Amino acid sequence: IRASFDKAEEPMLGDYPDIDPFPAQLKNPYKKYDDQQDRRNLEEPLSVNDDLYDMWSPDRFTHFKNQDALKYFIGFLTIFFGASYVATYFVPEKAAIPREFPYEGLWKESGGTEKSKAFFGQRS
Amino acid sequence: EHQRPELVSFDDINYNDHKKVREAQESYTREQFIRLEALKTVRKALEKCYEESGPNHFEDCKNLAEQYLDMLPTHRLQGYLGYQRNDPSK
Amino acid sequence: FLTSILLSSLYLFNRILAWQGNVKHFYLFASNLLLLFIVVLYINFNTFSNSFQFNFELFNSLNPFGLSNSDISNGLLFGIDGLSLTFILLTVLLIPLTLLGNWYNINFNSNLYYTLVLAIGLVILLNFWALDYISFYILFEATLPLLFILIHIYGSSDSERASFYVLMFTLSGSLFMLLSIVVISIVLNTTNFINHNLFVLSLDLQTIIWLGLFIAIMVKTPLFPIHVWLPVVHSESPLAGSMILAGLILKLALYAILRLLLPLLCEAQILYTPMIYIISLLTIILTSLATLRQIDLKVIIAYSSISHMGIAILGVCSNTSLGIYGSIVLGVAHGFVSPALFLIVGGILYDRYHIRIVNYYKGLTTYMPQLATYIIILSFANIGTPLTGNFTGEFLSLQGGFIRNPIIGGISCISVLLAAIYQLKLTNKLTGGISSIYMHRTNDVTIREKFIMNILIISTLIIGICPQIMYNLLYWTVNNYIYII
Amino acid sequence: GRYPFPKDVISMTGGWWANPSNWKLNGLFATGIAVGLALWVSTATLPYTRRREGITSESDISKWNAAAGVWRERHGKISTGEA
Amino acid sequence: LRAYNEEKELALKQRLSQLPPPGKAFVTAKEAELAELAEIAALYKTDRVGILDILLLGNKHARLYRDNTALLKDYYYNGRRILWEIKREGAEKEDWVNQMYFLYAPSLILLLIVMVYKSREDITFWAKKELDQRVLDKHPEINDAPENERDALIVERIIAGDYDKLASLQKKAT
Amino acid sequence: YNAISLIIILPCISWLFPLFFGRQLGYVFVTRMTSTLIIITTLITYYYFYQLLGNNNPINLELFNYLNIDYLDINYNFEIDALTITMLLAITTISSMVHIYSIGYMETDPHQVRFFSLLSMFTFWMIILVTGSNYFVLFVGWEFIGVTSYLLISFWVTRLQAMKSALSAVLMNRFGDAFFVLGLCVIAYVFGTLNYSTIFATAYLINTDLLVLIMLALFIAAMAKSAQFGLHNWLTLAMEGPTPVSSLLHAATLVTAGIYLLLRSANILEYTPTVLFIILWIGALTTLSAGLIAICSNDLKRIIALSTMSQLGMMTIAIGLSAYNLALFHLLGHAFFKALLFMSAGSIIHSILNESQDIRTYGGLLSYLPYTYICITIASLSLMAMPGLTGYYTKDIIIESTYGSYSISNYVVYWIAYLSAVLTCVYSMKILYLTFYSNPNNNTITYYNAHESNIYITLPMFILAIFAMFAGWILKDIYLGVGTDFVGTHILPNNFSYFDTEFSITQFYKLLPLISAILVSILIVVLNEFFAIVFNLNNKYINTVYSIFNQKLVSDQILNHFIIFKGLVTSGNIAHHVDKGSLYRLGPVGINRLLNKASYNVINLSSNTRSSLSMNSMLILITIVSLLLLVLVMNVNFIIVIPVLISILYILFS
Ligand SMILES: CCCCCCCCCCCCCCCCCC(=O)OC[C@H](COP(=O)(O)OCCN)OC(=O)CCCCCCCCCCCCCCCCC
Ligand SMILES: CCCCCCCCCCCCCCCCCC(=O)OC[C@H](COP(=O)(O)OCCN)OC(=O)CCCCCCCCCCCCCCCCC
Ligand SMILES: CCCCCCCCCCCC(=O)OC[C@H](COP(=O)(O)OCC[N+](C)(C)C)OC(=O)CCCCCCCCCCC
């Protein structure tokens, strides 16, 4: 009833009681059930798509609405990457040159031959 | 005993005899395996080069590494079917 | 001599039926004799020859009852290579295990059941010996009435619909197989597993012929358009029917795509491997995804078998030596590890509680610790967790499928994830939690069940630690089917 | 916590608080099997050990580089770098 | 090679004639009537028949014996389920363990051993020996080098040359 | 006597024998035996490290063939590299100390035979994962440590959250395993082998797009196991397993495996600049993200797990800067730190009668637990990199390696890592203040019954405190010399920036993280006692922000509702609407209805008339008329008679 896919399987059921789906975790823990673990009385009617509302289902957080939390998450991500990318413009530059190498940049040492010096070469 | 059966081709033979066709089949197959152990010999030689060389393996066995990576697309099992179903130069 | 052996043996059988009501002791004895005979044949097998070693002809005109020494041959040929003998060894070590698997649960009419199970095992044994297309096809559908009678008489509530589906879908794909076999036999005027790579057909005659054989293989290694009889014929079969089916029939169609299609449809096969890759990726992903919402317990292992056969088909259709070898290793290792899972769900779990719904079973460790040990070891062995033979097959088939097309190899590599999701989702539900309030405590696993399990686990572990032990049969047949010009 | 348990059930890793009376006596057997297996695996894998460096001469790898240059001369195979 | 007594078996059958059905012979939740049934269990357990009588005897002896062992097996196992019956130990052989541990399991270990030693015979060991034989064919001077120099001289010859004859086979291609 | 072989065989004995003989030997024997054997193993690996400091001449052992197929051979080959012995001594030391610790920590738990067997199989497959010498044995150990992580996080099978937590951990790792199978397939395709020697001998020749594909797949594997920001949810959800399992799985072992994948692949990483850039920015993301969770979360075990993955990001920053000696040295010291921190946390959880984990419920325990205090103070002063201790030498030199890089925008990650330096002081002081210095929050009887634990709990804390003090100063010349030939990694000559990064640093930039890390620590403790209103404001904006940072930077909600629950809903869509819905309408459920209707129509074809004879004799007339009319149409044109016959079938069958 409550979810959109639970609404989607409405016309396929016939001779089936059409329960309101309620998550088995968001039930009270202190009401005594027949199984304390699954939080279920012994002959209680099961919803369609009951394994999405079982105890063994996802954890189903309570504190934020899900659209709120997607806004907050994509918020923090674009906060970090935006500050990351604007902070590349305000950098200072170096106090040394990048160091260079003998034997014409070790090209024979880095595999190489004389036709292949730009492919396997260093600063010289 | 290390017996060496004779080498037969797909081209001299009549295909209506089965003896010669089966031998040309097995010949082409075993020749691909000989090719393959040549490739494996160069691979073990190259890793011996790398382990003995240490830091200068770039220049001691540039040519062994180039040889292994040039042999690798061409030295494998290819199958007798592709040559026996089709004739080039025809 | 050979007739006197048989009417001695028929008299042996008649006397032990007269003095013992059951058959099962003699069926076990004949099964283990068949084992020893096939291993003596493997001793005398020449691995250095590509040709077919132990040939015999049945129903020749010059000798209709018996062997044939003739200038002219129009009967049914039989003989083996290493590729045939791999599946023969896998078949022959499973036949005593399925006769043993129902040693106590079938009570009412036992002798009929064990005769049907041994008869199905013998038909599938002779399937791998065959050397004509018509000799392959005759034994290829001799199984179906025996399967119909077995599924219909023995089973759960719904064994009528399952028996109908195992006749219907199999017959419906295999009739189009017969269409292509008839076209081959009227063009070539020979049906033969020996000569048939020498004949070259036209390209558009090949592409007509290839369709009917591939439709039957799509029905029997069940790829996505018809993958659908399989959960119901598993979920409602008896135990040996399920075990023989998912250990041998699916691998039989995996054998048929090598034996029947790759030699004389080469130039067709190259044109069609993207369509096979569509269908096999699409039966890996969508079936592996549809297992996540299943209420029943044998149906999960049926859908698992779909996903593993979908991995094996892109190994055989990879045009690579690695893919062919990995598909053979996958078929043999799957034929080991999956009947053990069907024994876990159908033997140790349905004999004790007679329900198969997932919602009753929780916390099986605290009363059955070694059953739970078996469940987790088999779950990980089924996933693609290495040193198991399943990972060797899955890894080499994914590698061959990456060579033939790297993008469908990239999206086919996620089967490692998808195969583990549903399997571990089932396994932690079965093992974890407080013990179920619905289940009353029963016996732990017995000696015969542990015996079957230990054999089917050691034989995956030996292939998983060293897959080289059966390369000596396959190194010809891994080069035989490659078409790389 | 020492809640009661059923002694019905037999697991290979022990059960709940598994502590047999002859655990000294069995411990001597486990001691012997462990040291014998470790000693035997220790000596069995001895010739399968080798060092990483110093196995083959440098003569070997110099002439293998030379023969790789030979196999590269005969096929006219060009460098990575020249295009 | 063994034989049985028939009027032992007919006295057995009329012993079982006045006994209750096995569906109530133990449902009494004692040895006034439960001490004659454990005798009958112990008589089920021992082998009356051997193989020489199986072949040379006729059939109503066999039918007599068959319903005898059916009712005796019933009296053994139902007493074992409800409750010789009144003992508890572990030495026991069920019906399948004779030809699964002594025929199936050694045949399977035989299959393992035949696969392991049949793996010596393969194309990779043979192909390395053939490639060595071919370079010893072409260059026999490697023959009189000493033993571990021979190894690397073979390897440098393998790197220096094709030694296939694959283009030899494709004469129609060339 | 074979040193390379005993390292392998002794934890396998230590695993196989507690299972096969657990009922026969019992817990009091198997505990001492399992620990005894791992003690002998780690003494052997210390001695082997001491010998390899003599000559850099490693040992491999060879075993039988895994598979020989055409161009591809795989062998079981095992060598101890310098990199291998570096990881090996750390994992065996932490292994043996966690074994000795759990002797006394698990004293009243029933099932410790299975527990110690699972600990030593975890150790064993870690040994195999590190000492393997192709990518295949790396994969084998890589999977079996995930199987053991299932079997260890789910040790209490009765607990529901433990079962679901082990399920989430193994499915995250399996995501990474799928990407490693992809990269492994490309490895065996491109190089034709899996052996490290052949792949690193030919790595500089291979095309760079190929190597970007390979290293991205292997980095998604390493990123899943070493718990970066896309995939961090399972570390924090692995605290349902017990304390020494968490000190195995999070201090060294299971998170080090993902760093070991990149440290092996360093020689094939160098020829890529693309992947290393991505590695660096993912790690710079996770340092900040894990520090920001860890300041605002409240469970002690979760704070220490996020304290792990704040430093894993520092190590992958050191990967991204092309400096693998730094990441390896930090990897070495971090194991000793976090093992001491997890075990001191377990001793204060064990010492409280309540067995609570909320630090809001701890209160002051300085007077009552001085030994746990001094060990946790050593551990946190080392992890804050305060000088003279191991974390100085491991952790700071990465932060100035960010500045002394050659590339320009590495300067930005200088600040980012530095920010996470300050934050890793902050929560650390929280978990020293609210636990030892605060006014008490628990009831009085906990403070009556607070005592110190056994010798089995206190002795590994002593040994790892000594190690976490002295290990950096002894092993610094091994891993940070200015010219060192110990680790046989080959840095490209331009990606090597070590000589530049120790000399080009400002007085201010080197002075800065030391003095600031000590100033923020002293300020956070003095403000939480003297004032305590700065952190207990109740602006609802700061409470919203606090509960964002408390619920793991809302990531597990974003993963749960939008990937897990979404995927379960689409899988139900397939299992109902496609497989049972529309593939049966083209299958056995639709064909039954079609044949029912067609049969009903052709049977009612002659239902009408009372007469048999008039019915059938008119029926004969209709056909010998109709067929004649059809062929009259049909020799004119064949196209105009196909729909006539379709319509005749329609009116006949419907
Ligand atoms: C019921 C479905 C209907 C299907 C109908 C199709 C045909 C059915 C025929 C049923 C029986 C088929 C099996 C017949 C076995 C014959 C055995 C045989 O042919 O061996 C002889 C062959 C030649 O040997 P040779 O050296 O020439 O000297 C002869 C003296 N031994 O020796 C060799 O060269 C080696 C060959 C070894 C034989 C191995 C055979 C493996 C399978 C044996 C069990 C099969 C039982 C099948 C029964 C169910 C039928 C499906
Ligand atoms: C590009 C590389 C870089 C990417 C970086 C960013 C990555 C973001 C995406 C990450 C995806 C990670 C892998 C997803 C599978 C993880 C599965 C899992 O963790 O299951 C957990 C869930 C229990 O979780 P929970 O109950 O919330 O916590 C329990 C602890 N108290 O267990 C259960 O509830 C069991 C039932 C559900 C099991 C999952 C079923 C749905 C899984 C759908 C995944 C589909 C992936 C393939 C999609 C493509 C298919 C073509
Ligand atoms: C970490 C997971 C490993 C699991 C180990 C399981 C037990 C296997 C121990 C074999 C070690 C060994 O016997 O090896 C040693 C030998 C030799 O080695 P070689 O180099 O090939 O020959 C020498 C080459 N020379 C000459 C160049 C040096 O091996 C073999 O060739 C025999 C292969 C037999 C493998 C059969 C395995 C069957 C399954 C057994 C388990 C159910």
Coordinates of N, CA, C and O in Angstrom, one line a residue, chain F residues 38-95:
Chain F
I38 N 52.0 -19.9 16.6 CA 52.2 -18.6 16.0 C 53.3 -17.8 16.6 O 54.0 -17.1 15.9
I39 N 53.6 -18.0 17.9 CA 54.8 -17.5 18.5 C 56.1 -18.0 17.8 O 57.0 -17.2 17.5
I40 N 56.2 -19.3 17.6 CA 57.3 -19.9 16.9 C 57.4 -19.3 15.5 O 58.5 -19.0 15.0
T41 N 56.3 -19.2 14.8 CA 56.3 -18.6 13.4 C 56.9 -17.2 13.4 O 57.7 -16.8 12.6
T42 N 56.4 -16.3 14.4 CA 56.9 -14.9 14.3 C 58.3 -14.8 14.8 O 59.0 -13.9 14.4
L43 N 58.8 -15.7 15.6 CA 60.2 -15.7 16.0 C 61.1 -16.1 14.7 O 62.1 -15.5 14.5
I44 N 60.6 -17.1 13.9 CA 61.3 -17.4 12.7 C 61.3 -16.3 11.7 O 62.3 -16.0 11.1
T45 N 60.2 -15.5 11.6 CA 60.2 -14.4 10.6 C 61.0 -13.2 11.1 O 61.6 -12.5 10.3
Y46 N 61.2 -13.0 12.4 CA 62.1 -12.0 12.9 C 63.6 -12.4 12.6 O 64.4 -11.5 12.1
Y47 N 63.9 -13.7 12.8 CA 65.2 -14.2 12.4 C 65.5 -14.1 10.9 O 66.6 -13.7 10.5
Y48 N 64.5 -14.3 10.1 CA 64.7 -14.2 8.7 C 64.9 -12.8 8.2 O 65.6 -12.5 7.3
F49 N 64.2 -11.9 8.8 CA 64.4 -10.4 8.6 C 65.8 -10.0 8.9 O 66.4 -9.2 8.2
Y50 N 66.3 -10.5 10.1 CA 67.6 -10.2 10.5 C 68.6 -10.8 9.5 O 69.7 -10.2 9.3
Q51 N 68.4 -11.9 8.9 CA 69.3 -12.5 8.0 C 69.3 -11.7 6.6 O 70.3 -11.5 6.0
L52 N 68.1 -11.3 6.2 CA 68.0 -10.6 4.9 C 68.5 -9.2 5.0 O 68.9 -8.6 4.0
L53 N 68.7 -8.7 6.3 CA 69.4 -7.4 6.4 C 70.9 -7.7 6.1 O 71.6 -6.7 5.8
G54 N 71.4 -8.9 6.3 CA 72.8 -9.3 5.9 C 73.0 -9.2 4.4 O 73.8 -8.3 3.9
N55 N 72.3 -10.0 3.6 CA 72.3 -9.9 2.1 C 70.9 -9.7 1.6 O 70.0 -10.4 2.1
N56 N 70.7 -8.9 0.6 CA 69.4 -8.8 0.0 C 69.3 -9.9 -1.1 O 69.4 -9.6 -2.3
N57 N 69.2 -11.1 -0.6 CA 69.1 -12.3 -1.4 C 67.9 -13.1 -1.0 O 68.0 -13.9 -0.1
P58 N 66.7 -12.9 -1.6 CA 65.5 -13.5 -1.1 C 65.5 -15.0 -1.5 O 66.2 -15.5 -2.4
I59 N 64.6 -15.7 -0.9 CA 64.3 -17.1 -1.1 C 62.9 -17.3 -1.6 O 62.0 -16.7 -1.1
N60 N 62.8 -18.1 -2.7 CA 61.5 -18.6 -3.1 C 61.5 -20.2 -3.0 O 62.5 -20.8 -3.3
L61 N 60.4 -20.7 -2.7 CA 60.1 -22.2 -2.9 C 59.1 -22.4 -4.0 O 58.2 -21.6 -4.2
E62 N 59.3 -23.4 -4.8 CA 58.5 -23.8 -6.0 C 57.7 -25.1 -5.6 O 58.3 -26.0 -5.0
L63 N 56.5 -25.1 -6.0 CA 55.7 -26.3 -5.9 C 55.2 -26.7 -7.3 O 55.6 -26.1 -8.3
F64 N 54.2 -27.6 -7.3 CA 53.7 -28.2 -8.5 C 52.9 -27.1 -9.3 O 52.7 -26.0 -8.9
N65 N 52.5 -27.6 -10.5 CA 51.9 -26.8 -11.5 C 50.4 -26.5 -11.1 O 49.7 -27.5 -10.8
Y66 N 49.9 -25.3 -11.1 CA 48.5 -25.1 -11.0 C 47.9 -25.4 -12.3 O 47.2 -26.4 -12.4
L67 N 48.2 -24.6 -13.4 CA 47.7 -25.0 -14.7 C 48.7 -24.6 -15.8 O 49.2 -23.5 -15.7
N68 N 48.9 -25.5 -16.7 CA 49.6 -25.3 -17.9 C 48.6 -25.4 -19.1 O 48.3 -26.6 -19.5
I69 N 48.2 -24.3 -19.7 CA 47.4 -24.2 -20.9 C 48.3 -23.5 -21.8 O 49.5 -23.4 -21.4
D70 N 47.9 -23.1 -23.0 CA 48.8 -22.8 -24.1 C 49.9 -21.8 -23.8 O 51.1 -22.1 -23.5
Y71 N 49.5 -20.5 -23.7 CA 50.6 -19.5 -23.5 C 50.7 -19.1 -22.0 O 51.4 -18.2 -21.6
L72 N 50.0 -19.8 -21.1 CA 49.7 -19.4 -19.7 C 50.1 -20.5 -18.8 O 49.4 -21.6 -18.8
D73 N 51.1 -20.3 -17.9 CA 51.4 -21.2 -16.8 C 51.2 -20.4 -15.5 O 51.5 -19.2 -15.4
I74 N 50.7 -21.1 -14.5 CA 50.6 -20.6 -13.2 C 51.2 -21.7 -12.3 O 50.9 -22.9 -12.4
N75 N 52.1 -21.3 -11.4 CA 52.7 -22.2 -10.4 C 52.4 -21.7 -9.0 O 52.3 -20.5 -8.8
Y76 N 52.4 -22.6 -8.0 CA 52.4 -22.2 -6.6 C 53.9 -21.8 -6.3 O 54.7 -22.7 -6.0
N77 N 54.2 -20.6 -6.3 CA 55.5 -20.1 -6.0 C 55.5 -19.1 -4.9 O 54.6 -18.2 -4.9
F78 N 56.4 -19.2 -3.9 CA 56.3 -18.4 -2.7 C 57.7 -17.8 -2.5 O 58.6 -18.5 -2.2
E79 N 57.8 -16.5 -2.6 CA 59.0 -15.8 -2.2 C 58.8 -14.7 -1.2 O 57.8 -14.0 -1.2
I80 N 59.8 -14.5 -0.3 CA 59.8 -13.4 0.7 C 60.8 -12.3 0.1 O 62.0 -12.4 0.3
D81 N 60.2 -11.3 -0.6 CA 60.8 -10.1 -0.9 C 61.1 -9.3 0.3 O 60.9 -9.7 1.4
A82 N 61.8 -8.1 0.1 CA 61.9 -7.2 1.2 C 60.6 -6.6 1.5 O 60.3 -6.3 2.7
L83 N 59.7 -6.3 0.5 CA 58.4 -5.9 0.8 C 57.6 -6.9 1.5 O 56.8 -6.6 2.4
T84 N 57.8 -8.2 1.1 CA 57.1 -9.3 1.8 C 57.5 -9.5 3.2 O 56.7 -9.7 4.1
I85 N 58.8 -9.3 3.5 CA 59.2 -9.5 4.9 C 58.8 -8.3 5.7 O 58.5 -8.5 6.9
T86 N 58.7 -7.1 5.1 CA 58.1 -6.0 5.8 C 56.7 -6.2 6.2 O 56.4 -5.9 7.4
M87 N 55.9 -6.6 5.3 CA 54.5 -6.9 5.8 C 54.4 -8.1 6.7 O 53.6 -8.1 7.6
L88 N 55.3 -9.1 6.5 CA 55.2 -10.4 7.2 C 55.5 -10.2 8.6 O 54.8 -10.8 9.5
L89 N 56.6 -9.4 9.0 CA 56.9 -9.3 10.4 C 55.8 -8.5 11.2 O 55.5 -8.9 12.3
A90 N 55.2 -7.5 10.5 CA 54.1 -6.8 11.1 C 52.9 -7.7 11.3 O 52.3 -7.7 12.4
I91 N 52.5 -8.5 10.3 CA 51.3 -9.3 10.4 C 51.5 -10.4 11.4 O 50.6 -10.8 12.1
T92 N 52.7 -11.0 11.5 CA 52.9 -12.0 12.4 C 53.0 -11.5 13.9 O 52.6 -12.2 14.8
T93 N 53.6 -10.3 14.1 CA 53.7 -9.7 15.4 C 52.3 -9.4 15.9 O 52.0 -9.8 17.1
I94 N 51.5 -8.7 15.1 CA 50.1 -8.4 15.5 C 49.3 -9.7 15.7 O 48.5 -9.8 16.6
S95 N 49.6 -10.7 14.8 CA 48.9 -12.0 14.9 C 49.2 -12.6 16.3 O 48.2 -13.0 17.0

